[PDB]
Amino acid sequence: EVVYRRPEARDGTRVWELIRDTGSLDLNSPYCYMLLGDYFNDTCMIAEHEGDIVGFISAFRSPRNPETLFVWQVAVASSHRRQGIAKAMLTGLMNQKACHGVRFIETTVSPSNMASRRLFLGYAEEKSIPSTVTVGYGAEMFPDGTTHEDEPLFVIGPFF
Amino acid sequence: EVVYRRPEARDGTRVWELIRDTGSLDLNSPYCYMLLGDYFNDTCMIAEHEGDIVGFISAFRSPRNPETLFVWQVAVASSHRRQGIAKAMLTGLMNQKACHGVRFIETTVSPSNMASRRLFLGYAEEKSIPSTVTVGYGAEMFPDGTTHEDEPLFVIGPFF
Numbered sequence: 291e292v293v294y295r296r297p298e299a300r301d302g303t304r305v306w307e308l309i310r311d312t313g314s315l316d317l318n319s320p321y322c323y324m325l326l327g328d329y330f331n332d333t334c335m336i337a338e339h340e341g342d343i344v345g346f347i348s349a350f351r352s353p354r355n356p357e358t359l360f361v362w363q364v365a366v367a368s369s370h371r372r373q374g375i376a377k378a379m380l381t382g383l384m385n386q387k388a389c390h391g392v393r394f395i396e397t398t399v400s401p402s403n404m405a406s407r408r409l410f411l412g413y414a415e416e417k418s419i420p421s422t423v424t425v426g427y428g429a430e431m432f433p434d435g436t437t438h439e440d441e442p443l444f445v446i447g448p449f450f
Numbered sequence: 451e452v453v454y455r456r457p458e459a460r461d462g463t464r465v466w467e468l469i470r471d472t473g474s475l476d477l478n479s480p481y482c483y484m485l486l487g488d489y490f491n492d493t494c495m496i497a498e499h500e501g502d503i504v505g506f507i508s509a510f511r512s513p514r515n516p517e518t519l520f521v522w523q524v525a526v527a528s529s530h531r532r533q534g535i536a537k538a539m540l541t542g543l544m545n546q547k548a549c550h551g552v553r554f555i556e557t558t559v560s561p562s563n564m565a566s567r568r569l570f571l572g573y574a575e576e577k578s579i580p581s582t583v584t585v586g587y588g589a590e591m592f593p594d595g596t597t598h599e600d601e602p603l604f605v606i607g608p609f610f
């Protein structure tokens with residue numbers, strides 16, 4: 291019943307609205323999500339249920355180090371959380387030919403974001419892949435006026 | 451007196467504030483600009499004057515077609531406009547080894563954005579490089595609630 295597909299530029303508004311409706315502090319412009327759909331969609335995925343976008347994942351292969359897949363946004367609509375949708379987006383993304391050759395997954399996860407931590411660490415555990423945590427982007431790096439949590443870096447791999 | 455350098459993740463807040471202060475509808479998250487500084491900085495540039503960020507350009511090499519450099523954001527602080535700063539950012543970006551092998555520059559420019567149109571078309575004219583305009587992202591693609599201009603696609607090249 292949930293379908294997993296690539297986003298397209300035409301999806302940018304509905305992906306933006308999905309992320310907007312999470313309340314995320316890390317919402318990008320609509321234009322950004324349009325561009326992802328046209329230029330990065332080999333490393334992104336949408337989950338849709340009965341026509342509604344219910345999930346999104348965006349990643350890029352690092353320009354300098356293309357064996358690194360950096361996952362920079364994952365979102366599932368609240369009404370559809372804790373049903374395995376993010377896990378299926380992540381697992382599906384990695385199973386495609388576009389991710390052949392990825393040896394590390396890297397992402398940031400705030401200390402309070404248990405859901406995301408378990409998404410990534412559960413994927414690593416499933417595959418018996420090591421994980422480490424380093425400094426990422428501390429709270430103090432963010433603009434004054436808008437409190438943000440620390441964003442430590444999760445490095446998952448090597449996967450081969 | 452203006453210095454042209456790569457952004458770093460530590461610059462993300464000041465780049466965000468620069469773009470915020472333009473009033474652009476296409477402002478991304480602070481986190482986005484942090485990521486650009488760590489992962490895309492071979493295809494970005496900052497202009498700084500007496501320690502203040504006064505300009506920014508962000509681009510990526512298209513994953514599917516790395517001979518295409520897509521320029522997705524250019525901003526100069528109002529007080530420093532029409533002094534050649536964007537032209538120097540763009541020209542400097544293309545002169546680096548990181549852009550060796552770029553054969554096309556692609557970007558979107560609204561019909562009313564003469565400044566940006568002249569930035570790009572003036573760069574093409576300087577180099578006697580052809581340019582074409584196609585459909586890009588129309589106004590109707592953007593979220594209801596926030597009126598956006600059409601974003602036609604400019605394709606500049608081949609440069610070789």
Ligand SMILES: CC(C)(COP(=O)(O)OP(=O)(O)OC[C@H]1O[C@@H](n2cnc3c(N)ncnc32)[C@H](O)[C@@H]1OP(=O)(O)O)[C@@H](O)C(=O)NCCC(=O)NCCS
Pocket residue numbers: 312314362363364365366367370371372373374375376377378403404405406407408409411412413
């Ligand atoms: C993170 C998020 C995408 C997870 O989506 P989801 O579809 O609900 O996740 P899943 O159901 O696939 O679960 C993934 C794992 O996390 C666990 N999990 C999920 N939500 C959890 C919660 N609230 N508490 C504890 N564990 C949780 C699951 O048990 C599963 O673990 P497993 O791999 O050991 O089985 C979702 O909570 C979300 O959108 N959060 C807001 C946006 C966000 O913070 N994104 C990440 C930063 S960009």
Ligand SMILES: CC(C)(COP(=O)(O)OP(=O)(O)OC[C@H]1O[C@@H](n2cnc3c(N)ncnc32)[C@H](O)[C@@H]1OP(=O)(O)O)[C@@H](O)C(=O)NCCC(=O)NCCS
Pocket residue numbers: 472474522523524525526527530531532533534535536537538563564565566567568569571572573
């Ligand atoms: C577009 C922008 C970056 C240009 O920066 P800038 O440093 O003022 O531009 P420059 O001084 O380098 O000028 C570039 C060219 O545009 C012309 N130009 C600049 N501003 C102009 C204006 N307001 N009207 C007409 N021509 C203008 C220049 O004469 C020059 O032309 P040339 O190449 O034929 O000599 C700036 O106007 C800006 O930040 N705009 C708001 C953000 C934006 O719209 N960005 C683009 C979309 S992401």
